[PDB]
């Protein structure tokens, strides 16, 4: 069978249908708006205690408690307000590449390079956190995990596959396939009905969590997508790649809307997160710094320059009150 | 209000207790569940080796998890699909990766078609050949060593070092040398 010409003519039809819907660019629309100006954020807090590089961090829904994972094998919950460590969970495998805080606040998931997503229960009767569940159905390293509720969790693995589990029974409810590279990150929509995932094949796919199908696929990047995050509206998202460029895609337009790149920026991107209103786009780079882009004018609005090593993770509170950046330097800094 | 302070005190006590164990172990990646660990001990020093199985053949993303290890054990396979050239390319990628440029590499080495220059290569007389050994196999071994040193010496930056060989005592001594070189570079003496 040689239907590859059928495949290429179909993708060409897709490209022309995308071109027909492209009236103009986001710049021609947001050419008259006023720039946000110089955004200067000071390091309000510096959490210390991790003995190794922090790979991931996550805020709780109360904006006070944050969980950070380090490859010393320790998951620590910090009350960002008073810098005190609320919890310090010791992990079985030390290469935790992803940590998630449940929205209710009772559980924390962690995983990476052990093919297992471990769910730890916090609000326990014995007064000591313990392994609640061990989800083991993946064949590649866990790159990201996110809670839907206390009973459902979505994960993405290095085996080019996402999964939706049932934590109570501990078995894969749904399996999302279609990527051709390591899925490096995922992002749950605000309504949680959909979630987008970026992989190492320079493509980002949108999955309906209720079914198992792939709604849309987005291209435009030239290298591996390392970070992804929905717009607070839920109708667009942003991806960072190794080509030192952010791309803002729109779901209803099916094509990319904005590109954020400077000629003096030649280092990849490790983390991306919008602010509360979506006007700013915070992206951590390999230059050891973060950049705050104007997500409408595509012009750099600021640079958070306090890290001595590559920024690994980046998160923004649900109320947009602080920005927590972790790093291979082993220190989490809260910016405001 | 205040109970959080005693909780934090106990937690930092546990953390200071764990830091002594963490800084006392030497992590080692082995490149031939999701990762197989192995604790062993030499001269009361606890080494922790990790051979990573059940992963795909794409390494460019998870290899970055092993830049803070003491050394990367690198076992090549020559004694098919020309496996030695693939090992050379993998070693080159590891040597020139911007995150693994500070991680040393221990090389364990446990044909003229894929390398015609081997048909015109002379064994250096400065070698150390053990008796009862075919000149052919020692010539091949030193040729592979030179092919790997042609990559490990063309560098221009990075704090990495190469320790080729031709069994845990060699890894122990090489980690000791790595630690000595790191301490020397901390005082800017090297």
């Amino acid at each position: 069978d040689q239907l590859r010409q059928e495949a290429e003519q179909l993708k060409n039809q897709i490209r022309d249908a995308r071109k027909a819907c492209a009236d103009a660019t986001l710049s021609q629309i947001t050419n008259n708006i006023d720039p946000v100006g110089r955004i200067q954020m000071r390091t309000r807090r510096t959490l210390r205690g991790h003995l190794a590089k922090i790979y991931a961090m996550h805020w709780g829904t109360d904006s006070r408690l944050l969980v950070s994972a380090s490859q010393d094998g320790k998951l620590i919950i910090w009350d960002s307000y008073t810098t005190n460590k609320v919890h310090a969970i010791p992990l079985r495998s030390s290469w935790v590449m992803t940590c998630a805080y449940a929205p209710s606040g009772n559980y924390v998931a962690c995983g990476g390079l052990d093919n297992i997503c471990s769910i730890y229960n916090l609000k326990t009767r014995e007064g000591n956190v313990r392994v609640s569940r061990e989800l083991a159905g993946h064949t590649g390293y866990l790159s990201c995990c996110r809670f839907l509720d206390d009973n459902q969790i979505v994960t993405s693995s290095g085996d080019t596959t996402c999964a939706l589990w049932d934590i109570e029974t501990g078995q894969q409810t749904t399996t999302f396939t279609g990527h051709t590279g390591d899925v490096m990150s995922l992002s749950l929509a605000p309504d949680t009905r959909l979630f987008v995932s970026g992989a190492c094949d320079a493509s980002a796919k949108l999955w309906d969590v209720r079914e198992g199908m792939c709604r849309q696929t987005f291209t435009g990047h030239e290298s591996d997508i390392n970070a992804i995050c929905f717009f607070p509206n839920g109708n667009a998202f942003a991806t960072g790649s190794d080509d030192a460029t952010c791309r803002l895609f729109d779901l209803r337009a099916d094509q990319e809307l904005m590109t954020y790149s400077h000629d003096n920026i030649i280092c990849g991107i490790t983390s991306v997160s919008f602010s509360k209103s979506g006007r700013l786009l915070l992206a951590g780079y390999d230059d050891f710094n973060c950049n705050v882009w104007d997500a409408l004018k595509a012009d750099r609005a600021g640079v958070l320059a306090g890290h001595d090593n590559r920024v690994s993770c980046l998160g923004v509170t649900d109320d947009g009150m602080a920005v927590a950046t972790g790093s291979w330097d082993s220190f989490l800094k809260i910016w405001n | 209000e205040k109970a959080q302070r005693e909780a934090n005190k106990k937690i930092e006590k546990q953390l200071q207790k764990d830091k002594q164990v963490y800084r006392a172990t030497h992590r080692l990646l082995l490149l031939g569940s999701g990762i197989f660990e192995t604790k062993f001990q030499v001269d009361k020093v606890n080494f922790h080796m990790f051979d990573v199985g059940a992963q795909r053949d794409e390494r460019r993303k998870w290899i970055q998890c092993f830049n803070d290890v003491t050394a990367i054990i690198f076992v090549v396979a020559s004694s098919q699909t020309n496996r030695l050239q693939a090992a050379l390319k993998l070693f080159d990628s590891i040597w020139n990766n911007k995150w693994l440029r500070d991680t040393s590499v221990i090389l364990f080495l446990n044909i003229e078609d894929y390398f015609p220059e081997f048909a015109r290569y002379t064994t250096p007389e400065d070698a150390t050949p053990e008796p009862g050994e075919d000149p052919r196999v020692t010539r091949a071994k030193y040729f592979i060593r030179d092919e790997f040193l042609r990559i490990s010496t063309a560098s221009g930056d990075g704090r990495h070092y190469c320790y080729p060989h031709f069994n845990i005592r060699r890894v122990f001594n090489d980690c000791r040398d790595i630690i000595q070189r790191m301490h020397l570079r901390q005082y800017e003496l090297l």
Partner: nanobody, 126 residues
Framework: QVQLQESGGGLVQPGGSLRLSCAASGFTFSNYKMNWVRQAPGKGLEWVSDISQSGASISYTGSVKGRFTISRDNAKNTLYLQMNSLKPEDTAVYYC?????????????????????RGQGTQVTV
């Protein structure tokens, strides 16, 4: 959309000569180091040749050293493998591969199966 569409090469008698072309589209051809890999009938992928961004540093595998020549053209964004004195051990599918990241001297995950940023390949049989 990384395309990496390669063409050229057919059935040529032993000792002949061919020129495999590789037109790449969807990225800046000058920022990435390019490679030629090949897959023999019933064998795993293997690395053949490479060329840097500008084109100064060039390396080949031992078997094709002196016979094959790689050359990139950044103005036309095209890779070329000029092969001559072909041997009966060169019949294979030739893929035009790309390094995953720009401005890097290392090149991971090439020669691996199910690796993106790689062309479909041309069947060069002798």
């Amino acid at each position: 959309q990384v395309q990496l569409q390669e063409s050229g090469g057919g059935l040529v008698q032993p000792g002949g000569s061919l020129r495999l072309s590789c037109a790449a589209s969807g990225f800046t051809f000058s920022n990435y180091k390019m490679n030629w890999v090949r897959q023999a009938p019933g064998k795993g992928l293997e690395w053949v040749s490479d060329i840097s961004q500008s084109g100064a540093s060039i390396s080949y595998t031992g078997s094709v050293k002196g016979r094959f020549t790689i050359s990139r053209d950044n103005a036309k964004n095209t890779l070329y493998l000029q092969m001559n004195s072909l041997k009966p051990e060169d019949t294979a599918v030739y893929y035009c591969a790309r390094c995953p990241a720009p401005f890097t001297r290392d090149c991971f995950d090439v020669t691996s199966t199910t690796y993106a940023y790689r062309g479909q390949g041309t069947q060069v049989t002798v």
